[PDB]
Design a protein around this ligand. Structure first.
Ligand SMILES: Nc1ncnc2c1ncn2[C@@H]1O[C@H](COP(=O)(O)OP(=O)(O)O)[C@@H](O)[C@H]1O
Ligand SMILES: Nc1ncnc2c1ncn2[C@@H]1O[C@H](COP(=O)(O)OP(=O)(O)O)[C@@H](O)[C@H]1O
Ligand SMILES: [Mg+2]
Ligand SMILES: [Zn+2]
Lengths: 49, 302, 42, 619
């Protein structure tokens, strides 16, 4: 969790795909939204409320 | 950093800039590049010139006829049964599209590569059609091909027979130089001097490659009618001479001199005038092109 | 080896085979908390 | 929660109702509506440049935020087509809006379909990779309770892209009294559904890099418009998908491209005409019908000199003969096939590249580039269902099309014999233990072999000098021999032509940097495609005079006396040569738009074969 510069050689690269940064959810009963939830960066999921 | 070979240096110069592609109002395509074949001896710096030219082209790949270590020569495409995607292994020809391939051991090439190269060289594609797809890859490449003659060096007794390539792959070319180091005492002692001078001493390269890209992107050289008429006259004369040597020897010449060679002079003149970025190449440029072409034709009439 | 995570304009700037000098942040994955324990995929 | 009014939606629907309103203008979109109503098709294709010129801001808004904007567009479309015909507009619960035009910044490729273009109608070219089974999806499901004599209609909303709830996804099976409900499949309503996968073209893609592909969900109206291997341009809405319910999420949002339309990127199905062009073709035919074949033949393949007989023959190929399928399915082919054999530097490959650039659905096959299983079709298992699917080959792709065989001499005997039934009957009967089929490839073949020894020896016979069996040379119906005479006079001819074409430039468009029925007669020197395309359809029947003359000339050709000594046959005269005579006669008549093959075409055909086949070996 520090700042690290390194030398390396790439050997593959997965596709460019879509990870979220803001996500709006909505309830199933009243349909109220809970918009603009701060999804974290990097590989870090988020347990729904 | 090579002793002599001045015609070969100027030939490499013309090669690196190459001609100018023609797409005609019908739709057909004519190449805008030059091919340099370098038959000859071991001792001369054939592979070393190949090495430098790869270094000095903007984009260039120096390979063997027998593919490369974990890299083919022509491209291939193959279905992937899991994901169904047609993965495209890129050979030298396509990995240096828009560039200079420097093939070595052209004599010693694969048969599949021989066929695909026959399609690829003078007309700029590599078509492949696997079980599902039918591609036509784009292969814009200029060839610097080396090779040895079969019998070690050029023996004079086997002239007109000491080459194993087919005429339908010497046709594709635009100048074909033989290199033999036969009997030159002064040249060879000076050559020893030159090489050890390199050993002890050890424009610019980056500037030259940038200038090469600059000329190629900026100017389209395309000859003038007077130059075309001069080339016409010397073309009839050259073809008459080739026919004459053919019937004199009474056996068909081992190296075509064809309309491909006419257009080779055209491309050579265009590249020369590209050195000055003048969109109308001069009769002087076409004359020096014919000079280089006669120094190429030294073997055919021979 | 190391698994690497790019971002918006670090994506597709490098193609497979290109050596890199790359400046980033060491990290372990966070997906909700094998003879070993406490070993998340770095 | 019904909305009373929204200024945005009202404004957008008004703007697009105006856009569809085409009477004060030339009537283009009104005509489009009328023709699609007549067709029963229910998608209307609106050009984005039209939308941009009439209102740039709406084009920006729509190309930045599609789905609701297109809901407005489609509601306007329903209102408009109701005003033209309320009865038809009532017929379909929705009508749709395809797109077209210059998607300037919105034209990328699947390598360059970044995360900037979400909910934006992106344009993307690429090759298909998969073709999932086109299976139904239920939209409005009707049920019947027999205990209570009841009927219900559960309703489903196509939330393929939004959030979807179990309450929306319920399929009812019991009433309130726990009775059994029986589905009414017919009374229900369904829409097709197919997934496919577009891929960055390998001719376009980076050389050394893995493929990149995007998933495309074709709902109804776009079921079979894209099979694997095809070139296709897809324009539609890149979006995100909902992960199924669950208290956790990683940020991953696997994305798709709900295609708004897909068109054939080949751009070779191009019959685009006007009535003036039809009249132009008609006069071009009828005024000088008798010389028109030579007009076309001299015209075809400029930027090359002479070879006039070969130009005539490639016309006979491209125009084609006429396929015949008699009473019991005895299918006698109607394609020409030409073998260029000749010295190097005789523009054989240039003719091949000409027909590649011109003839629609032309495809190149190299000697050892394509090989057998690649050339003809193949059978392979799925591995997702253990079922044998069929992978159409180069020839099957080229069904009713052209294949240009570079270096035909170099195809090994296995493939040279694998091409046999496609050469004659235009089919490949493939089979393995699970599945068998007769794939149909009514192809035409222009093949440029090269001679043995690397160059033709004049004194040696053609059969000695061609490394090809009489078996195959029968199946080929014409073999044209292209020698480099090397004379200075014809060299002057060819050379002046060649250097003139080296001097020809883009007229005016260029400065010095490198990269109508008749033509403006440029001294240094389109409708070809138009006329040959219309020419292909005509079936000019043979006259009695032509049939008797062509028969007698064939008998003469069979007889040995017709060839003098010192000449050597290049292809033995089997009955394939007679059928060649008939096919070439039909192709000439089709050039003339005759509606009958006459003695003129018959004698042209016999002239063609007499020049093509019998060669004068010299001593
Ligand atoms: N004229 C020359 N001057 C200096 N070194 C030379 C010369 N010719 C050949 N060499 C040396 O010989 C080596 C091998 O030659 P090479 O480039 O392989 O040509 P070839 O393939 O014909 O042998 C090179 O590494 C180069 O250093
Ligand atoms: N009949 C012809 N008319 C004009 N130019 C020709 C003719 N034949 C050959 N050429 C020239 O010779 C070159 C030969 O190229 P290509 O056709 O690819 O090789 P090949 O003729 O061996 O198939 C062409 O670029 C063309 O400019
Ligand atoms: Mg070498
Ligand atoms: Zn709630």
């Amino acid at each position: 969790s520090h700042l690290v510069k390194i030398p390396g050689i790439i050997i593959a690269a997965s596709a460019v795909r879509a990870k979220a940064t803001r996500i709006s959810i909505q309830c199933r009963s009243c349909r109220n939204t809970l918009t603009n939830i701060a999804m974290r960066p990097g590989l870090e999921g988020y347990a729904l409320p | 950093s090579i002793f002599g070979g001045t015609d070969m240096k100027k030939a490499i110069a013309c090669l690196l800039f190459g001609g100018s592609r023609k797409r005609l109002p019908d739709g057909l395509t004519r190449r805008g590049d030059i091919n340099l074949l370098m038959l000859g001896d071991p001792g001369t710096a054939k592979s070393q010139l190949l090495k430098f030219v790869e270094k000095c082209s903007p984009i260039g790949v120096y390979t063997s006829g027998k593919g490369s270590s974990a890299a083919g020569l022509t491209a291939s495409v193959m279905r992937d049964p899991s994901s169904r995607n047609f993965i495209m292994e890129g050979g030298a020809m396509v990995l240096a599209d828009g560039g200079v391939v420097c093939i070595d051991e052209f004599d010693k090439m694969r048969e599949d590569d021989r066929v695909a190269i026959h399609e690829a060289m003078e007309q700029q594609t590599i078509s492949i059609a696997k079980a599902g797809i039918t591609t036509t890859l784009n292969s814009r490449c200029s060839v610097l091909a080396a090779a040895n003659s079969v019998f070690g060096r050029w023996d004079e007794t086997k002239g007109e027979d000491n080459i194993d390539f087919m005429p339908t792959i010497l046709s594709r070319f635009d100048m074909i130089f033989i290199v033999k180091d036969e009997h030159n005492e002064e040249r060879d002692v000076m050559l020893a001097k030159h090489v050890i001078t390199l050993h002890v001493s050890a424009i610019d390269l980056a500037k030259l490659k940038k200038f090469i890209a600059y000329c190629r992107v900026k100017c389209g050289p395309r000859l003038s009618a007077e130059a075309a008429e001069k080339l016409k006259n010397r073309y009839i004369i050259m073809r008459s001479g080739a026919r004459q040597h053919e019937r004199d020897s009474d056996r068909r010449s081992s190296i075509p001199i064809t309309v491909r060679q006419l257009e080779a002079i055209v491309r050579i003149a265009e590249a020369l005038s590209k050195m000055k970025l003048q969109p109308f190449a001069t009769e002087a440029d076409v004359e020096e092109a014919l000079r280089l072409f006669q120094v190429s034709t030294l073997d055919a009439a021979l | 080896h190391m698994q690497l995570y790019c971002d918006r304009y670090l994506c597709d700037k490098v193609v497979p085979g290109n050596r890199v000098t790359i400046m980033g942040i060491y990290s372990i994955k966070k997906f909700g908390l094998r003879v070993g324990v406490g070993i998340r995929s770095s | 929660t019904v909305v009373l009014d929204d200024v945005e939606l009202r404004e957008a629907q008004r703007d697009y109702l105006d856009f569809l309103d085409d009477e004060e203008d030339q009537g283009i979109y009104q005509s489009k509506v009328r023709e699609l109503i007549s067709d029963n098709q229910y998608r209307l294709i609106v050009n984005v440049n039209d939308l941009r010129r009439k209102n740039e801001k709406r084009a920006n808004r729509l190309l930045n935020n599609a789905f609701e904007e297109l809901v407005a567009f489609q509601r306007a479309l329903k209102d408009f087509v109701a005003s033209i015909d309320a009865t038809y507009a009532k017929q379909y619960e929705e009508f749709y809006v395809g797109l077209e035009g210059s998607f300037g910044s919105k034209h990328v490729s699947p390598r360059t379909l970044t995360s900037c273009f979400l909910s934006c109608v992106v344009c993307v070219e690429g090759i298909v990779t998969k073709c999932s089974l086109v299976r139904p999806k239920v939209v409005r499901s009707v049920h019947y309770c027999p205990a209570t004599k009841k009927t219900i209609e559960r309703r489903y909303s196509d939330l393929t892209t939004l959030v979807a709830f179990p309450s929306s996804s319920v399929y009812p099976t019991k009433d309130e009294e726990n009775n059994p409900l029986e589905t009414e499949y017919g009374l229900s309503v369904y829409k097709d559904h197919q997934t496919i996968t577009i891929q960055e073209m390998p001719e376009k893609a980076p050389a050394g890099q893995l493929p990149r592909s995007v998933d495309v969900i074709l709902d109804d109206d776009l079921v079979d418009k894209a099979k694997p291997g095809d070139r296709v341009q897809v324009v539609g809405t890149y979006r995100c998908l909902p992960g199924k319910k669950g208290g956790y999420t990683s940020g991953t949002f696997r994305t798709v491209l709900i295609a708004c339309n897909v068109k054939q990127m080949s751009k070779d199905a191009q019959p685009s005409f006007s009535a003036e062009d039809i009249a132009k073709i008609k006069k071009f035919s009828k005024t000088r019908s008798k010389d028109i074949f030579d007009q076309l033949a001299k015209s075809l393949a400029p930027s090359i000199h002479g070879h006039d007989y070969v130009k005539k023959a490639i016309l006979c190929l491209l125009l084609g003969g006429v396929e015949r399928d008699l009473e019991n399915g005895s299918h006698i082919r109607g394609d020409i096939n030409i073998l260029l054999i000749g010295d190097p530097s005789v523009a054989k490959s240039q003719l091949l590249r000409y027909v590649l650039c011109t003839a629609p659905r032309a495809i190149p096959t190299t000697g050892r580039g394509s090989s057998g299983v690649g050339l003809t079709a193949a059978v392979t298992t799925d591995q997702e269902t253990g079922e044998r699917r069929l992978e159409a080959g180069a020839m099957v792709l080229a069904d009713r099309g052209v294949v240009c065989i570079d270096e035909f001499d170099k195809m090994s005997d296995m493939d040279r014999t694998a091409i046999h039934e496609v050469m004659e009957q235009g089919r490949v009967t493939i089979a393995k233990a699970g599945i068998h089929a007769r794939l149909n490839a009514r192809c035409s073949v222009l093949a440029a072999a090269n001679p043995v020894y690397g160059r033709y020896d004049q004194y040696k016979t053609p059969m000695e000098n061609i490394g090809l069996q009489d078996s195959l040379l029968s199946r080929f119906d014409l073999l044209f021999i292209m020698l480099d005479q090397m004379d200075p006079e014809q060299d002057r001819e060819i050379s002046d032509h060649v250097l003139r074409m080296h001097r020809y430039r883009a007229p005016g468009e260029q400065d010095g940097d490198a990269m109508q029925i008749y033509e403006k007669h440029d001294n240094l020197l389109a409708f070809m495609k138009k006329y040959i395309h219309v020419a292909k359809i005509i079936k000019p029947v043979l006259t009695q005079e032509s049939a008797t003359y062509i028969a007698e000339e064939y008998s003469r050709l069979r007889s040995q006396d017709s060839m003098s000594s010192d000449t050597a046959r290049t292809s033995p005269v089997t009955a394939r040569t007679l059928e060649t005579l008939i096919r070439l006669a039909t192709a000439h008549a089709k050039a003339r738009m005759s509606k009958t093959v006459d003695l003129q075409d018959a004698e042209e055909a016999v002239e063609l074969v007499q020049y093509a086949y019998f060669k004068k070996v010299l001593e």
